[model samples]
Target chain A: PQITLWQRPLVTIKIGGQLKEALLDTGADDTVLEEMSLPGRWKPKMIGGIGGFIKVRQYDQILIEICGHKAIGTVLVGPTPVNIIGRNLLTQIGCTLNF
Target chain B: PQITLWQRPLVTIKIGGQLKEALLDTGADDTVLEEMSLPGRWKPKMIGGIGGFIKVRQYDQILIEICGHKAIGTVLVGPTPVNIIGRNLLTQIGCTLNF
Candidate 1:
């Protein structure tokens, strides 16, 4: 299956049994979600983007479902303007950039 | 052709006759480049992202070449931490997210 870029490549995703919308960001190294509650312990980590570095709670082994594809990986919770599905999970679903 | 996502999907882009590497950022709304001298007059605009809003010089109808695809669109130059190729140029190349 394929998804076309429309302004921003946004997709519906299910995380921790909750549905949410996330931007499919190939440029991001880690998947970052807006501050949310999850049943797990997380460590503090800092990530840098177009602007600067941001502190985030890094949770490991998170179950994620994107467009019917499933994967378990690290998910970061932070004060982000948008939720981003980065390469960490995109690769798990065999996603590739095609032209 | 398809490009695999490796951590961050970085690609080579040519702007203003200068070759540089930029992140293929589907999450970004507009293409942003590090502060560079371009042969054109630009107007000041503000754009917001994960961290906060930043002032930029917006250039219209700028030529951009990405992965052998040519596109002319609005390009913003600012104090960006990284160079990003946004949807403005990606759509011109018929790029899609495939899984």
Candidate 2:
């Protein structure tokens, strides 16, 4: 599947059986979601962004569905102002920057 | 031309005859460059981000070269820690998010 670049490259994604909208951030290294509840135990991790850094819960082996494509990857639940779909999950969907 | 997604999606771009590396930020509405001098005059504008907003000099009719494609668009210069190629320029380059 292909999507043209929007003013904000936002898309809907399903994680942990819940659906939410997230910005497709190519600049981000890992997917960061608004604080949410998950089933398993996770490790604490810190992620840096435009302004500063924030702490997150790194959950592994999570099932993520993006635009009909499903993949298992790591998802960081944190105090992010917005949900971000990063390269970690973008690659699983075979996302590319094309002209 | 097509480029695979990088861990950080960093790319080289030519702006004002100077080459620099910038993050391809789909989430950013406007292109923000590290403080630099331009030939023409620009107006002051404010841009917001995750943490807060900052003032920038918005330069219009700027020629930007990304990869092998050329585009003319608006560019903002200010005290940004990193150079960011936003949707304004990405659209000109016909960049798409594909899977």
Candidate 3:
């Protein structure tokens, strides 16, 4: 899928038995979600950005379906305004940035 | 140019009279620099993300060149780990996300 930047590069994703929109963030090193209760136990992790850092729970090997592509990786559960699908999983889906 | 997600989508940008590497971040709403004493007066602003929010100086109508493409917009100066070339400018260069 070719996504234009006229608006946000948001794509439909399926995870945790639900569907949601996520940002295809090339800048973020890791993926982050608003808040989801997953099965396995998670570890405490801190993620930082332009603003600062925030402590969140990290769940590893989680399966996520983005735009019909299935990917499994670490996803941090936090209070972000939007869910971000970072390079970790974007790479798995063969996502790319083009100019 | 098409960029793979195998690695970070980092691009060289020209700003503040020098060249710097910045991430082509689709998740970020605005561009942010680590800390550069930009010319002209700026206003105090706050930006939030996964963590929370941080106070930063907002300089509007600033000129920036990414990958040799010139663009002007608002740029935030603060303590960010890396420079981010957000959608504001990515759209200027006709950037897109393709899978």
The candidate, 1 or 2, that scores higher on TM-score is 1
What does candidate 2's lDDT look like per residue over A1-99, in tens digits?
Answer: 667676587889888778899988887777889989988989999776555567889999989998788977889998888898888888888888888
lDDT of 2 at A16: 72
lDDT (C-alpha) at residue A73 in model 2: 84
Cα lDDT of model 3 by residue, B1-99, tens digit: 788877888889999899999889888888888888899999998888766687889999999999988999999998778898888888888888888
**TM-scores for every candidate against the unseen true structure:** 0.96, 0.89, 0.92
Write out fnat for all predictions, comma-separated.
0.80, 0.72, 0.89
Could you tell which candidate, 2 or 3, scores higher by lDDT?
A: 3
The 10-residue segment with the lowest total lDDT in model 1 chain A: A1-10
TM-score for candidate 3, please give it. Answer: 0.92
Q: Would you give me the overall lDDT of model 1?
A: 0.88
Better-scoring candidate (DockQ), 2 or 3:
3
- Segments in model 2 whose C-alpha atoms lie over 4 Å from true places: none
lDDT tens digits, residue span B1-99, model 2 = 666675677889998788999988777778999989986999999886654567899999998888758989899998776899988888888888888
Instruction: Provide candidate 2's TM-score on chain A.
Output: 0.93
Predicted candidate 1 versus true structure: per-residue lDDT over B1-99, tens digit per residue? 888987577889998889999988877778999999998889999898766788999999999999888998999999999899888888888889998
